[PDB]
Amino acid sequence: LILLFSRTALTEKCKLEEDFLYMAYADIMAKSCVKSF
């Protein structure tokens, strides 16, 4: 999946698209992230 995104990023286009898959899965991955010590 990240390889697909890296391809889509590195693809020469002169304009970034919206990529709702990116905006979903990036949010998924961001949201995937005396005893108190």
C-alpha 24/C-alpha 16 separation (Å) is 16
Query: Residue holding tokens 């020469």?
Result: 12
Resolution, in Å, please? 5.1
Query: Residue holding tokens 């898959």?
Result: 21
C-alpha 31/C-alpha 22 separation (Å) is 14
Please note each residue after which the chain is broken, C-to-N distance over 2.5 A, or write none: 33
Residue 16 vs residues 1, 4, 13, 19, 36: alpha-carbon distances, Å = 18, 15, 7, 9, 45
Query: According to the entry, how was the structure determined?
Result: cryo-EM
| Contacts for 8 with CB less than 8 Å, ≥ 6 apart | 19, 22
